Design a protein around this ligand. Sequence first.
Ligand SMILES: Cc1cc2nc3c(=O)[nH]c(=O)nc-3n(C[C@H](O)[C@H](O)[C@H](O)COP(=O)(O)OP(=O)(O)OC[C@H]3O[C@@H](n4cnc5c(N)ncnc54)[C@H](O)[C@@H]3O)c2cc1C
Ligand SMILES: Cc1cc2nc3c(=O)[nH]c(=O)nc-3n(C[C@H](O)[C@H](O)[C@H](O)COP(=O)(O)OP(=O)(O)OC[C@H]3O[C@@H](n4cnc5c(N)ncnc54)[C@H](O)[C@@H]3O)c2cc1C
Ligand SMILES: O=S(=O)(O)C[C@H](O)CN1CCN(CCO)CC1
Ligand SMILES: O=S(=O)(O)C[C@H](O)CN1CCN(CCO)CC1
Ligand SMILES: O=C(O)c1ccc2cccnc2n1
Ligand SMILES: O=C(O)c1ccc2cccnc2n1
Ligand code: NA
Ligand code: NA
Lengths: 587, 587
Amino acid sequence: GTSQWLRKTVDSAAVILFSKTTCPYCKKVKDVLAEAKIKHATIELDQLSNGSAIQKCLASFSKIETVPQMFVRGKFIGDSQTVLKYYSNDELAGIVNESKYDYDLIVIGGGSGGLAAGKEAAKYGAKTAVLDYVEPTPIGTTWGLGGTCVNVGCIPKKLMHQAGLLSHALEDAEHFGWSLDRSKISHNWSTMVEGVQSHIGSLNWGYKVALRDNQVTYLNAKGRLISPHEVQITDKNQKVSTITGNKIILATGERPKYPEIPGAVEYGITSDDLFSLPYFPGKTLVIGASYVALECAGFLASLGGDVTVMVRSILLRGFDQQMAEKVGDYMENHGVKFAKLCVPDEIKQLKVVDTENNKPGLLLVKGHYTDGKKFEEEFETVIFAVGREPQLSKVLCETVGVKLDKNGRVVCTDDEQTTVSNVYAIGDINAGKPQLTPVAIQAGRYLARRLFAGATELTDYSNVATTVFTPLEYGACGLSEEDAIEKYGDKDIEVYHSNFKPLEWTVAHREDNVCYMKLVCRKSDNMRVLGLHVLGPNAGEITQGYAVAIKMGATKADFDRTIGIHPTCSETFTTLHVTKKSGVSPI
Amino acid sequence: GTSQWLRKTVDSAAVILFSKTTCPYCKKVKDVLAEAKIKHATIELDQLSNGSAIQKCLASFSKIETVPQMFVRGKFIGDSQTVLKYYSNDELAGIVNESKYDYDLIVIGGGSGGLAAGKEAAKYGAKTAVLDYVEPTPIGTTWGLGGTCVNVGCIPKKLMHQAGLLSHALEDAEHFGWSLDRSKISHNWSTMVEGVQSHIGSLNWGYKVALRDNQVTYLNAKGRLISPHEVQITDKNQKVSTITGNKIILATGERPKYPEIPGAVEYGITSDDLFSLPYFPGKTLVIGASYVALECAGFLASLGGDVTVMVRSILLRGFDQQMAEKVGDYMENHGVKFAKLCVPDEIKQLKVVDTENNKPGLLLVKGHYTDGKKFEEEFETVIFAVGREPQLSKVLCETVGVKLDKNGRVVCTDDEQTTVSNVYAIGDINAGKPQLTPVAIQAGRYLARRLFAGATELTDYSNVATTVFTPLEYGACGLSEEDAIEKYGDKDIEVYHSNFKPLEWTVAHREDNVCYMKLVCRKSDNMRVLGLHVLGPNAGEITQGYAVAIKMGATKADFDRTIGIHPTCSETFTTLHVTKKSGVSPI
Ligand SMILES: Cc1cc2nc3c(=O)[nH]c(=O)nc-3n(C[C@H](O)[C@H](O)[C@H](O)COP(=O)(O)OP(=O)(O)OC[C@H]3O[C@@H](n4cnc5c(N)ncnc54)[C@H](O)[C@@H]3O)c2cc1C
Ligand SMILES: Cc1cc2nc3c(=O)[nH]c(=O)nc-3n(C[C@H](O)[C@H](O)[C@H](O)COP(=O)(O)OP(=O)(O)OC[C@H]3O[C@@H](n4cnc5c(N)ncnc54)[C@H](O)[C@@H]3O)c2cc1C
Ligand SMILES: O=S(=O)(O)C[C@H](O)CN1CCN(CCO)CC1
Ligand SMILES: O=S(=O)(O)C[C@H](O)CN1CCN(CCO)CC1
Ligand SMILES: O=C(O)c1ccc2cccnc2n1
Ligand SMILES: O=C(O)c1ccc2cccnc2n1
Ligand code: NA
Ligand code: NA
């Protein structure tokens, strides 16, 4: 079926050139396009394990069987002579710019995926437009280009995580001989925010420049897909116009949920507001129990905040629950209070946010524990981190025919195509995909390659590694222990585990047997590593590399015959020997 | 050749039991041995892809073809009935303790390998003795059980590395909002040493306990191999006696070299003395340019020391030299001065080490740069880190027949066997092996398994990963770029690289385009990753996991289809696209 790949490639590509590596006439075309700064994909049949079939099938479109053959938007343009002619006649610019639509690609959403897809697309000649609009939060918070991660996600989250960790670094420096009294050091929230925001500001700027430098049109406008090839844009001045595109990528991401209770929208905040908050939250109630709730509670606590987490049911639903308990136990043991089995009922305002002195308001939270007791406590800030939801009624008219799941996420095929053929969805809105920035980036860039460069490589959403940046980080790749057990049976699952202690925690006099790691393996598949789990410092760095081995089908034996790097936390994976079925202690 | 494996196993094993998983009579023997606390290897023919051949060949030794068959030191002991009998007759203790020699194993050297091998051996019934003696340094420095790593190596080295890094953590805490003036914080060397030494002291203690709890005999005595099965020990009281062992493991490690120049032994020190030094080195000259020299210079500089490094030729001979230059450039740019192309000629004493106030002496170093200029400078401490050499004339009489290479290291086969059949060498003295603690541990434990438990798995010394814990850490796994180019040719080597900036360095206002990583790949082998190189924080944690993938034959494509964890340094390996042959900037 090489025929069909060529049909799809030639159709969607904006400017593509078929060629061979060592080719006299092809290089004559390349040199011309370069001089005229005409960006284009290039397929080297020379370097393809089926290029002979392609070069012939190519005559289905060109009537010709020789390279170089140049195409513009499903349309053959000519051999060497015909191109050199267009150029010499100064008509080559107009030939490559012909198009039914204003753009080869319109990306609705200027975040991790949208920017990645849009930047990669222009690399291969796609006349591309990126649309981004940040609907303000209920209290007015807004921000610039870059998406959730850049502005109110991974980036500020980790920076404030890092500011938190330095709390422990300041405590440790004493044991390591530095002459500072941890007791006499405070943290200024505003100084931290100003630095975080300065860096986000440079990222906002950097993306705008990246789009300008790649001839990508950046529109700060709310995009609405009204027909498969028509996008309606409302700009800052409420001016409505319409633009057309061949391919459409939906990448509008999500936004925080608010529980439907009185005072929540009016008096509480979310992650969207926290990372630029002009005042220190103060005594803070985080409502929620997944990774945003615990990350935010973690660094607020480490930055000297009185922090409470309200847990309806469990921590980190969908994560390995043994790890989640270990995560929570560390936070409980380092300040964060947990109001277990507890749901809010209303948020009464007691003080308005003092905009003068940048100080938080004051709130009364009325709730109830599940055992009947009434929760009634005062907090200066209440943060909802109870989930995130797509906002696609604002992006689609169901007129168009983009099928959404029950959760409002776009239903796609394994190539991110929607039920409308020219329309794709990447990132958080793509149903059932892990909602992570590098996933959105990869999906976007790989999708861009298939459309405008004839690539075939799909994105592999399996065994995507992750790290919860709680005070004690938790990295994972693969199945939770309970999922593997459920998927294959207790009897087919062996679990190697060990506690460990960072060497840095020895002189610092931090805890024995708190850090912990485990490999979840399948006995009947050569002890294949199904899931990897590490609770410890720098769990992100630890886990990443193993995600390569796991994608390759790593077994327990592949870990054992690797030699550790000493001294590191990560090396504990190369010497795991205690199993769970044996009952021996992982200490 | 299952015959030969069984011959070797039965001969060397101390107490071994052949059995099947689901076996009535075998479990009757196990239960007896457990009750009597008789440690033993156990081969489950049930679980071996050739156990049928073994169970028959077994009758070569027992005259019997059924399980359970128990052997003691090359000698069949009996089926179920014969064992249950010995036990009931209370003669089973004496049967398993019969031996021509005092010990099944004598380990000469109580360090990383020796302790690992000795502990693993006793696990399988080996009547084991571990010998350790720390010959004092020229100035009298000595230490307890554990080896180079524990006492004067990885452990104190990394702890002082960590104390150094906190210097930058204290600077950064300000930008992240913490109210401390880095300018007004000093470091006390003695407090750090006391904490490092307290932890080493607990390790010294922990190993002694580990050996006691595993019925291993620990002798604090200098061992000398005088005949294949006889070891001569000189204890603390100069009392000479002799002990016999079936198997001998040489694991005596190495010690620092001193250059043959006046004043070096008398007035300078080495790594062996640095990590317990009662006084801060002060203005320090490190003589040497490999990983000890730069690690020690790095943290001395970060701890407020005026530090100079004397480089005869190049930094990190045998490492990727591009990385080494990047390593050195970072140290040069953060305090450490380099006296390039410079060799010392004498060390004159100007002040004696003040033992009263714990203050360093004072020294005059006379040298010459290669361009003729005379080096003449005063330093409070001079540290030689110019290499390490084995000390085996003190451990062997060439009488015995252990072949040593030209460098004095034991020449071994791929199973660590020496030219004397019962004698093995692990760790730094094993010629041509990477001189690293986890290598010595693995070699030791795997060797112990082959001897006393019938294992066959050899240690894999290929693509062993490593990390130089310089101020900016440098992790590597596989070939340097120059080695791969040399081994396969420039044309067959593609190098993907990228600079990067830790997110933590943004608010901290540290350097752009200093951190750096590269994959060295072979074009003609599916872009196999031949070497991995990362200069950046926590390079140990970053590199470890990738060492598993590389051992598995990871390609560039295996990296690309792995999804990054964001935000981390390590994730930059999953998106590498700039090559060197292209000349594009890695910024
Ligand atoms: C607190 C928090 C912390 C996180 N930490 C991590 C982490 O550590 N590691 C990780 O991998 N992931 C993390 N994530 C997830 C990560 O942010 C998302 O996976 C990533 O942002 C998804 O990229 P995207 O393009 O799909 O959506 P987004 O990044 O949200 O981009 C969507 C853009 O399109 C805009 N938009 C919406 N509708 C329209 C419209 N009609 N027209 C124009 N623009 C529109 C949106 O306002 C936004 O600017 C975190 C998320 C949060 C909320
Ligand atoms: C400053 C320094 C830093 C290092 N950092 C790292 C690192 O970060 N990561 C890493 O992987 N490796 C590191 N190493 C290397 C590591 O220490 C060695 O690879 C490891 O110690 C080797 O273990 P071994 O058993 O072979 O030798 P050793 O650990 O040296 O043990 C040998 C023991 O036997 C003793 N001995 C010698 N002769 C006799 C005798 N006749 N009788 C009885 N005992 C004897 C010795 O005194 C010693 O106690 C470092 C080394 C140094 C010097
Ligand atoms: O392959 S899986 O679907 O098993 C896992 C995905 O690749 C990535 N994960 C990341 C973590 N998520 C929830 C916490 O484990 C689920 C999706
Ligand atoms: O497989 S190799 O022999 O190529 C490498 C070894 O496995 C481990 N290395 C670690 C670093 N060493 C010198 C610096 O690269 C050489 C041995
Ligand atoms: O969609 C997911 O499964 C998902 C999304 C975001 C995550 C963040 C940290 C840890 N795990 C995560 N999992
Ligand atoms: O023997 C070796 O090759 C060897 C020994 C020790 C090392 C320490 C850090 C980095 N590399 C190293 N390499
Ligand atoms: Na989003
Ligand atoms: Na040694």
